[PDB]
Structure formats: C-alpha cells, structure tokens
C-alpha cells in the first residue's frame, strides 16, 4: 500500500468487525445520537486482476455510531453475490460498471446461449452506492434492481431484495427519494424497441398491512415516459421530486442499447456502452405524481450532465430544480481509477460540477408571445430565463448558484424537503481548477452568502456532508454537519468532522482508529430519536 | 484548401483524365521505359461527412508513364461499386475500413434481420491499396476478395474479380506475392468457431486451359493453419515467401471476431474491432508451398507488428525473414485522419517501423540441448538467436538492420526474389523521432553502409521507392529508383524523383503539373520491354 497519494485509497480494504471508540477532540450536541451508514467501494484488486473504474470497487460499508457523546467505527464488505463469487474464485467474476466479467467459453456467438441471451438478465448486485430507507430498515443499493437489507448495528448482510419482482425495469437509480410518509420513489429504464423511463412509488410498509415492516411489496408504476431515441436512452444517476411532480433530465450521456444488450458477446462493459451526444439538447421530462401523466410542455436546455439533484420544489406555478451541473461529463472516463490515481481527475475543467438552478414554468399564459421570458414576472427568478419559442416549446437557461465546484449535495430534509429552502451543503471531492482550499461548501440559494470549511492540508478529502437538525431549533441551518474526512496520506489520520451548520465552525472531530476510510460515495444518518 | 500542411492531402482529388507531359529536370537511363500505376486514397469527404482513417479514402489511381526519356501523368478514381454509389450521394454511403455507412433502421437486434445477419455478406470493394499482376494484366486490390482489372494505358476500371469464387475466404491480403512463373500466392482468413488462415496459389492463367490470359480461375488451397484463438485471429497486412515456404506472423493485432460479426448492430467499423493483445507472444506459422504441410516447430517471439515483409529466403537450412518491425501498433489509431492532419503521427515513437531480420532454423539437431542457440554455428546469423526451449519450442530474437525508421520496403525482385540478397529500399513517410531529414533509405542487409536521400524541405514526403534494373547490370543495385515525392504545401510542386540505386544520388526529377498527388500507398512498375 502506497504511503501517499490517491493510489493509497485504491488498495483493498479489510473488515473492521468490532466497533471501536474513536478519539474525540471537542464537543458534540446532546442530539447527536444515531447511526450513519456509509456506502462505497473497497475491493479494487483480486489476485493480479484490477477493477477499472471508481464505481467498480466491491461494496465496503462503514458504520459511524454516535452515542453518549462518543463515536464508534466499524466496517464490513457487503456479502453480495458479486463479492462472494469473486472472493471464492480469487478472480474478477461478476461484471460491474466498468470492468469485464471473466469470459465464459459457453457464451460465444457460436454457442447455444446466443439463441437464449435475450431471455436472460444477468444479476448485477454490487450494491455499493447508497442506502435507501424502507419502513424500519436500510437497503444497500446500486443502479440495478438487486438490493440487500443491512443491519444497522452489525453491518451484517441480510436478505436480498429484487425490485424487478414488482415493476418491469432493467436499471433504476440508487438514489430513490422519499417523503414524510416514508413512501419511496424511483425511476428505472425498461429497455426495448420503445425504451421507456418508468416512474415508481413504494408505499411505507409500516403504514399499511404488509408481510413485514421492511417490505417492498407495495410497489407500483406511477407512469412512464418514452426515451426520445429508444436505442439511445439517457443514462440516469438521480432525479428530482417536488410535492406534486417527479422530474428527470434526458441527458447527453446515452446508453448504446444494442451494444449493451449484446455486451456478453462483444465483451463490453456498461461503461463502454455510454456515449456523449453533445449534438443534442437536453430535455426536461416531468410526471405528475397524482395522475401519472406527463406535463405537456417541451422543455429544452443546452447540453450538460448532473450526477445529483439537490432539492426540488414548486413555487408560484414554477418547478424549481437545483442540481450539480457538469459541462461535459463525456462517458465518465475522468473517474477511471488510472486517472484518479494520478490526482489529475481534479483538474478536468469541463468535468467539474457546479451547483445550479433552473426554473420551469408549469404553464404558459395566453398573453405570452414567442421571445418572452416567462419568468419576467417572477422576481425571485432573476438569473434564470425560460423563453417561449416560436413552436410553443420553452428554452431554459440556468443560474450558477456558487462558483466553488461542489457535488454530493445534501440539505435539511426533515424541514424543507420538497419546499422552498436556502442552503445546499456539498463536498469538493471532484476537484477544482482555481486552487481553492474549500472542502465543504454551504451554498446560499437566496443571497449568495456562501460559507466554506477548508481542507487543512493537501491530504484531506471531504466526503458527503450530512445535516442533522437540532430538534429544539427553528432556522433551516440550526443543526450540525457530519462530514467524513478521507486521507490520502499516512501523515493524516482519517476523521469525522462535526461542524456547526450555521457557521461551518468545527465543534468536534473523531479520529478513525484505522489508517484509511474509503474514497466512498453516499451515507445515511438514522437518528436514534 | 489550406496553403500548407497535411490537411491539404485530405481534400478530395479530381480526375486528370488525359496524360500530361511532366517538366523534366535531368536525365534518365535508356532502360526507363514502362508504366507505373500507383494506388491510394483520394476521396475523403462526401457532402459534409468525412471518412475517418487513412485507409478509407476511395481509391484514386495514378499513371506515371516513362517513355522517350519523358514522364506522362494521369489519374482517375477506381469505379468500384463503392465509388459508383458515393458520387451519387450526399453522405457517406459506402462503408470502409474505418468509417460506418448511415444506419439502416430495419437492421436492429429487435428486427427480423437479427435472425438473418449471419447469412449476409456485404461486398467491400474499395480496392485502393495496391496492384497485383495476374497473367498479362494488373488488378487493383484491397484486403477483401473484391478486385478490379485496370487498363494500363487509360486507368479505365475493367471487370471485377471476386477471389472468393475460387477459394472460401472472407478476407485476404492485398500484398500477394508472385514468382518467375507468374504464380500468385496469398493468405486469407476463413472466420468461424475454428478460424483458419488459408494459403492459396493462383497458377498463371497463361500456359494453361483458362477463360483468358488474366483469369484467377486456377486458384487452389495449398493448406491452412488454425488461429491460436479462433475468436481473435490475427490481423494480417503481408506475409513472406521463399522458394519452398510461405510464412506469416500471428501478430498481437487481433480481430475481435464476435464484435465484427455483430458490427451492424453495435455500429462498429472493422477498425473498431481491432485490438492489441500485448500480453501474448507472437507466433511464426510456416507452410510448405509444395506439400501444404505446416512446419512442425513451435516458434515464439516477443510482441511486435509488421505492415510489410521485405524479402524472404532459405539458406543453410534456415528461413530468413526481413520485415519492417513496429514495437506497438495498437489498433492503428495513429493513422486516423485526425492524427495525420496534425503531423503528430510522425512522432509516435512506439509506432515507428524499423527494418528487421529474424532467422528460423527449419530443423533441430539431435545434439541440441535446451538453452542452446541453434544459430550458434551459423556465422552470418550474428545478432539473431533461436534458442531451443525446454518444451521443444524455439524462441527467436531479431536484429535491427537499420537505425533509420523506414517502411514501404522494396527490393530488386527480378534478381533476388526468394534469394539471399543485400538491399532493401524504403521510405521514411511514417516519421522519425530524431529530427532527421532522411527521405529514402537503402538499407544494407550484410552489415554494410546504409545510404540516404534527404528530403529537401519539410513539405516533401517520400513515397514507396521502386527499383528498376539496368538490363546490362550484374550488381544487385545496378539500376534506378522511381520515388513519388508528395507535397504538403502549395509552395512545393509534387514530383517523381529518379535516383541512382548505387549511390541514391538524383539523376532526374519529373514535376507533376498538378498541385497534389495523393498520400498514397503502393505502386507497380510494368516495364515496356
Ligand atoms: Fe451518487
Ligand atoms: Fe501496404
């Protein structure tokens, strides 16, 4: 394992099976009682073989448990089929986002399988992206229907769950959204000659007669919207939800569907099948949550990609969408492990994300004429324009909310999910081209008074910040942020940073009693009460 | 069209239908009476679309006719099916090596054609590579069975010839070798679950019951050798021939056969389907020309690729093979038109070719022990080793003949084809990494002095040198070289350079009365007597 640099983060992690108390410096509030589960990649080499993409590493989950003003750390691999098969074969066996599976001599274009492959859907279950709450439990997810319930206290892998038993989808996001009733929404792709994006809701099994309090059984299709090009449907990482609407971008990142359906024979990864179609406008697709009907407006924007939406809400007949905008994501080669090991991913200017707002008029007034900015009468919409076109469509321009590049956006879900709001917290892990020292950004959506927490040295890397509210608080930022601080150097111990969300001033940190924590993805904080 | 640079060479050429006398400076020998036909790419744009690879341009043939101490120039497109379809087009209609045609909406994996595609074979007849003599005529060839007879005087496209009507191959080289009897040898690939390399002879249609004196009908399989990996057979550009043997390299450039067979659905070019398998040794495959039996020796080398073999001959029970060795050819992306337009192709150090010799022992003595260099008692084999292996195989190492990078090798075919010899003439068109000005190289295979003719300015590009013998001569180099000098500048007229082969000193040049001649490939000189 290398002493310093990003290669250090790509050596295999080992289980930390027993929770270890972490060295605390500072103080935490009385309401910091709960458990944060973090998902991400942890196994990058198997024997002499190496995974290719950041998204590929086998899921290695961590538990950050807060109790009596202390923090306890543990970590374990997810016991997926992908993991078990690879550990038992000491070879890369299961396909992942960007690494080939072992070639099967019985699956060639000259074998009988070539006559059966359309009947088959190969299970991809490296659920290393995030955790999704369903009733009383958390499920580890990736961008497939194949999930695992995970024990909050022990990180034990419990039973598998197959989303596609309830709705016919081939892929789906690992970023399901949920509301105050605990109902869980997703969008998935059903591939075919008329590929469609399928919008789903899963009712909270606790609020209804169910087989158990963590069941997915109450899952149904809300509606669906066809891909513009059925053979090149958009890739999708996340989507947005307001009180009444679900919204997605038809991005320039497209899946080459015929190549993916044949990928076993042409020996292509899912990653190989992504293409950047810069010659096409982005479209906004909006579905009514109650009727399942698509909003009848054509909504076009200049090309861009977003991994993550922030919050989404309705105001004055408009749909407000915040998201982290990337000018040209390509096909995500920037996040190949070879390009991250050098650190050069951080300086790919066209790939860096910036928090961005777009404002969609949900109706066009009868007095409006082509060329009119339909937002001109919306005072709070300054910096966005949504211009009526000659053909009745609308062209939307965005406002960059913050000049500091940021991603992994989070907000005060308990108070203002699906409502007008002021703050987005994010991380600068993707990089920066202006030399800024920022690690965590608190972006101000109303007055532009942004706050930052700076990385203390070049070996610190900020993870996704999680907002935990003060139960006795009233303002949107009355709470703390939990921020995992990863380390790319043996000179820097990893730690969990606790910030006052109002000021981004540190109140405590907890040093991890291990040399490394993963260059990970998303985390979920479950309060004890 | 730009005033200067390689982009000049990638604008479409226009027909020059009538021979134009060229401005002569200097003097030529009395025996320079004959016709040189040159093949190469000339049409690179169709409407606003552009072909992608150097190998793609539709064939544009030139005639350089030497007579009465004069040279006459004319040029015309080859009237293939591809050309005929394309002039009547506005987008790329005929697919080539590295460019797709427009997609057929009825040929998706969801259509009935997906059940029929293995029965269908699309004709690729852009015969733009070289000319091959068969009886009394010349045939324009590419790396497919589809050829055209071409009139020596008018460049008129005559009748098509389909090699696959006489032997079952899917592809074959455009670098057929021939002997003093006018027999024509090739190697072609028959793809399938046990892909094989098929070795062929075409008996001179003269001296035999034939439909005419240029017929391919007397074509038979000499034998065949299976690919080591039937789904990854080697790409092949050329091969070698001695008095009694045919020899080919199983190179690291491999065809991804499954991807190629499915290329209509995954929208891949043949070029896209080439891959560099750097982790594999090169194998030498040798076939006896008379008996069709494969040499029962296993012969391995460190990876490399060669476009062009030079001469090949037997001596003292060994098989001597000369060829232009490239360390890492990748999948030929260096020769994409985008990378040639910038001139940067000339400085890809691992892609540059170097004339090279390897020496194959055709038997292993009973006294030989593993670890023995089987060439140790062969005095002239210095710098080469063929070391017997523990498993009975032979591992061969090569000798770099000349330190100046060179390709398009030619030799004094009339005197020493298939015999021991001294000289290879070549061009530096592929580039150089040391800034040298060399244009034409005369390499000495007997450890002698290599001679060079230097380009006069950076806008001169040397084509393939052809050796024309002095009939009164005795020495191997008693003759002249004909060298097309292409121009990348409106300040430089293209011309044909006539060099004394003994000294590589110019005796004459003929200025072409056109602004450009193509960045072309191979040429054939047919003497008038
Ligand atoms: Fe994500
Ligand atoms: Fe060639």
């Amino acid at each position: 394992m290398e002493a310093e640099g990003f290669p250090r983060l790509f050596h295999n992690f080992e289980n930390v099976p027993e929770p270890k108390e972490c060295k605390k410096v500072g103080s935490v509030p009385s309401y910091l009682t709960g458990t944060m589960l973090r998902n991400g990649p942890g196994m990058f080499t198997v024997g002499e073989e190496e995974y290719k993409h950041w998204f590929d590493g086998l899921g290695f989950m961590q538990r950050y448990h807060f109790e009596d003003g202390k923090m306890f750390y543990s970590a374990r691999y997810l016991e997926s089929e992908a993991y078990t098969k690879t550990v038992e074969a000491q070879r890369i066996v299961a396909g992942t986002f960007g690494t080939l599976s072992f070639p099967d001599p019985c699956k060639t274009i000259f074998s009988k399988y070539f006559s059966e492959f359309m009947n088959h859907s190969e299970k991809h279950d490296n659920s290393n992206v995030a955790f999704t709450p369903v009733g009383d439990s958390l499920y580890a997810c990736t961008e497939t229907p194949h999930m695992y319930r995970v024990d909050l206290d022990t990180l034990k892998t419990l039973e598998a769950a197959d989303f596609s038993k309830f709705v016919a989808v081939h892929s789906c996001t690992a970023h399901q959204l949920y509301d105050e009733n605990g109902d869980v929404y997703n969008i998935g792709s059903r591939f075919g000659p008329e590929s469609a994006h399928v919008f789903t809701v899963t009712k909270n099994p606790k609020n209804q007669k169910s087989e158990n309090d963590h069941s997915w059984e109450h899952t149904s299709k809300i509606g669906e919207i066809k891909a513009s090009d059925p053979l090149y449907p958009t890739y999708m990482h996340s989507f947005g939800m307001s009180e009444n609407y679900l919204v997605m971008f038809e991005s320039p990142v497209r899946l080459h569907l015929q190549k993916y359906l044949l990928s076993e024979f042409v020996r292509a990864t899912y990653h190989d099948c992504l293409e950047w179609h810069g010659d096409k406008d982005v479209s906004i697709f909006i579905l009514n949550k109650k009727t399942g009907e698509q909003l009848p407006l054509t909504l076009k924007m200049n090309p861009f990609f977003t991994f993550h939406h922030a919050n989404t809400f309705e105001k004055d007949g408009c749909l407000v969408m915040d998201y982290c905008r990337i000018e040209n994501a390509g096909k995500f080669d920037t996040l190949l492990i070879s390009n991250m090991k050098t650190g050069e991913f951080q300086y790919d200017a066209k790939f860096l994300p910036y928090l961005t707002r777009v404002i969609v008029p949900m109706s066009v007034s009868s007095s409006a004429k082509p060329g009119d900015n339909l937002l001109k009468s919306v005072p709070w919409a300054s910096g966005c324009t949504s211009i009526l076109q000659d053909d009745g469509s609308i062209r939307l321009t965005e406002r960059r909310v913050c000049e500091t590049s940021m991603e992994f956006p989070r907000y005060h879900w308990e108070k203002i999910n699906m409502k007008e709001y002021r703050y987005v917290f994010g991380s600068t892990v993707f990089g920066r081209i202006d030399g800024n020292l920022a690690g965590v950004v608190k972006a101000d959506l109303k007055f532009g008074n942004h706050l930052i927490w700076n990385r203390e040295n070049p070996h610190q890397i900020c993870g996704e910040p999680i907002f935990v509210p003060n139960p006795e608080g009233i303002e949107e930022d009355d709470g703390i942020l939990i921020v995992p601080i990863m380390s790319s150097s043996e000179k820097q111990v990893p730690f969990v940073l606790i910030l006052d969300a109002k000021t981004l001033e540190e109140t405590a940190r907890f040093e991890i009693p291990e040399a490394r924590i993963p260059l990970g993805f998303h985390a979920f904080y479950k309060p004890k009460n």
Side-chain angles (χ1 to χ4, degrees), chain A:
Chain A
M1 173 172 84
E2 282 88 350
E4 186 171 313
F6 279 91
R8 178 174 175 90
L9 293 167
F10 293 112
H11 293 278
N12 291 350
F13 281 75
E14 292 186 296
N15 292 335
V16 181
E18 201 69 31
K20 298 167 147 208
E21 185 174 350
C22 299
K23 180 189 171 46
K24 168 189 189 181
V25 180
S27 54
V28 297
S30 53
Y31 55 84
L32 185 53
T33 57
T35 308
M36 180 172 78
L37 298 197
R38 185 168 182 249
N39 214 343
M43 185 176 290
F44 303 99
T45 65
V46 189
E48 297 299 291
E49 298 177 1
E50 303 186 335
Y51 289 100
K52 306 278 183 180
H53 198 273
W54 187 21
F55 299 173
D56 295 347
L58 300 190
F60 184 77
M61 309 176 291
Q62 314 109 65
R63 173 183 184 260
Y64 304 86
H65 177 65
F66 300 87
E67 190 182 69
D68 301 323
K70 313 166 176 291
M71 194 189 75
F72 296 84
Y73 177 82
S74 55
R76 295 186 185 266
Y77 281 102
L78 180 74
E79 300 275 340
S80 58
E81 295 192 19
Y83 174 79
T84 303
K85 289 191 197 193
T86 293
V87 158
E88 284 169 8
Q90 286 297 305
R91 304 279 303 275
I92 292 174
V93 166
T96 50
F97 172 84
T99 306
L100 290 165
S101 54
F102 76 96
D104 190 337
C106 288
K107 295 184 186 188
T108 82
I109 192 178
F110 301 119
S111 73
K112 73 177 287 193
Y113 180 72
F114 185 64
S115 306
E116 309 163 19
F117 75 97
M118 287 299 285
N119 298 309
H120 288 129
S121 288
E122 189 64 24
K123 182 194 228 241
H124 289 256
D125 74 335
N126 178 28
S127 308
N128 69 347
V129 176
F131 289 99
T132 291
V134 169
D136 66 356
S137 298
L138 293 183
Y139 284 87
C141 296
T142 176
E143 297 181 355
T144 77
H146 304 289
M147 305 170 289
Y148 288 87
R149 193 162 62 100
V150 176
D151 187 281
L152 186 69
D153 297 326
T154 67
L155 292 178
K156 178 183 175 50
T157 301
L158 305 179
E159 74 275 359
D162 184 347
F163 192 67
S164 71
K165 158 168 179 198
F166 307 107
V167 173
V169 298
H170 296 107
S171 68
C172 49
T173 85
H175 285 304
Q176 300 95 326
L177 301 181
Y178 48 93
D179 63 19
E180 71 279 0
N181 296 327
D183 295 340
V184 174
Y185 297 81
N186 208 353
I187 309 178
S189 290
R190 190 207 319 119
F191 302 136
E194 298 182 281
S195 295
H197 303 284
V198 179
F199 297 69
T200 68
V201 57
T202 296
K203 305 297 189 71
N204 189 340
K206 302 191 319 177
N207 298 336
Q208 200 176 332
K209 176 162 178 172
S210 310
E211 306 172 28
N212 54 66
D213 280 349
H214 50 79
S215 172
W216 286 87
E217 66 196 80
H218 301 303
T219 296
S220 60
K221 173 171 58 176
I222 305 171
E224 69 183 53
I225 297 176
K226 288 177 184 175
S228 295
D229 301 315
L231 303 183
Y232 292 94
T234 185
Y235 172 77
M236 179 181 313
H237 191 72
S238 68
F239 63 92
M241 173 172 87
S242 68
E243 183 185 352
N244 297 302
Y245 299 97
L246 295 159
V247 56
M248 57 167 281
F249 291 121
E250 188 175 58
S251 90
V253 182
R254 304 297 190 83
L255 180 69
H256 181 351
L257 178 58
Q258 294 195 261
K259 182 182 182 176
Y260 186 56
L261 292 174
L262 295 165
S263 59
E264 299 166 288
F265 309 105
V266 307
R267 298 291 288 154
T269 66
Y270 184 88
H271 178 219
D272 292 329
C273 298
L274 297 179
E275 311 179 346
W276 179 265
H277 292 205
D279 52 310
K280 297 174 181 172
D281 290 327
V282 165
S283 304
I284 309 178
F285 293 164
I286 297 166
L287 200 84
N288 187 303
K289 271 160 72 170
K290 304 294 192 301
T291 68
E293 200 76 359
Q294 174 178 7
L295 191 81
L297 291 174
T298 298
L299 305 168
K300 306 303 255 269
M301 305 179 58
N302 289 336
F304 72 96
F305 180 73
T306 180
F307 281 102
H308 288 114
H309 289 256
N311 190 29
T312 310
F313 63 91
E314 295 152 48
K315 181 182 174 77
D316 293 346
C318 300
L319 182 68
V320 184
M321 308 164 55
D322 300 330
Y323 52 92
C324 294
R325 179 192 189 276
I326 291 175
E327 174 65 30
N328 189 328
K331 48 183 279 283
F332 309 151
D333 284 1
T334 301
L335 302 177
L336 284 160
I337 285 172
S338 62
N339 194 56
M340 299 191 72
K341 278 173 174 170
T342 65
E344 280 309 282
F345 75 103
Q346 303 169 109
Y347 315 112
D348 186 350
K350 63 177 186 308
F351 193 79
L352 292 178
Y354 299 84
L355 182 63
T356 294
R357 172 167 285 190
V358 76
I359 301 170
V360 184
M362 306 291 270
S363 58
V364 183
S365 80
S366 45
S367 75
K369 297 173 190 169
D372 288 355
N373 173 20
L374 303 177
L375 304 182
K376 189 174 179 183
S377 53
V378 185
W380 52 268
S382 174
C384 297
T385 71
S386 301
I387 298 173
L388 184 56
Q389 300 300 297
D390 200 7
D391 62 0
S393 65
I394 300 174
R395 289 205 67 86
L396 301 85
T397 66
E398 332 93 307
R399 151 166 96 79
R400 176 168 293 182
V401 173
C402 179
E403 300 299 317
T404 305
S405 175
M406 60 189 293
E407 238 295 344
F408 292 92
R410 299 291 295 258
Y411 55 88
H412 184 170
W413 181 96
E414 291 87 347
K415 187 183 288 293
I416 45 70
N417 188 45
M418 298 182 290
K419 303 178 184 312
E420 187 176 8
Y421 72 123
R422 193 154 163 201
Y423 301 120
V424 173
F425 310 93
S427 158
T428 65
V429 59
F430 273 72
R432 75 291 308 173
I433 44 80
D434 54 11
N436 78 75
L437 301 178
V440 172
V441 185
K442 175 186 178 192
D444 178 358
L445 291 154
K446 298 186 175 177
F447 301 94
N449 300 315
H450 316 299
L451 302 179
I452 52 82
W453 181 88
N454 286 326
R455 291 122 59 205
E456 295 174 326
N457 58 60
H459 315 300
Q460 289 177 3
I461 305 153
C462 290
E464 177 186 57
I466 306 301
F467 180 92
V468 182
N470 183 353
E472 298 165 4
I474 62 119
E475 315 232 337
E476 187 182 325
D477 54 359
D478 195 340
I480 55 95
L481 301 180
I482 306 173
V483 194
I485 307 302
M486 304 150 278
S487 164
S488 57
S489 173
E490 60 182 11
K491 300 176 171 65
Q492 170 68 64
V493 184
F495 59 98
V496 167
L497 177 69
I498 306 297
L499 299 179
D500 183 338
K502 298 185 200 167
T503 58
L504 295 197
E505 295 280 320
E506 171 182 357
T507 75
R509 65 179 61 183
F510 295 97
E511 300 192 353
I512 308 295
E514 299 292 339
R516 303 173 302 154
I517 61 172
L519 189 62
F521 300 131
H522 298 279
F524 190 95
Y525 177 83
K526 190 169 193 159
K528 192 76 169 63
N529 48 58

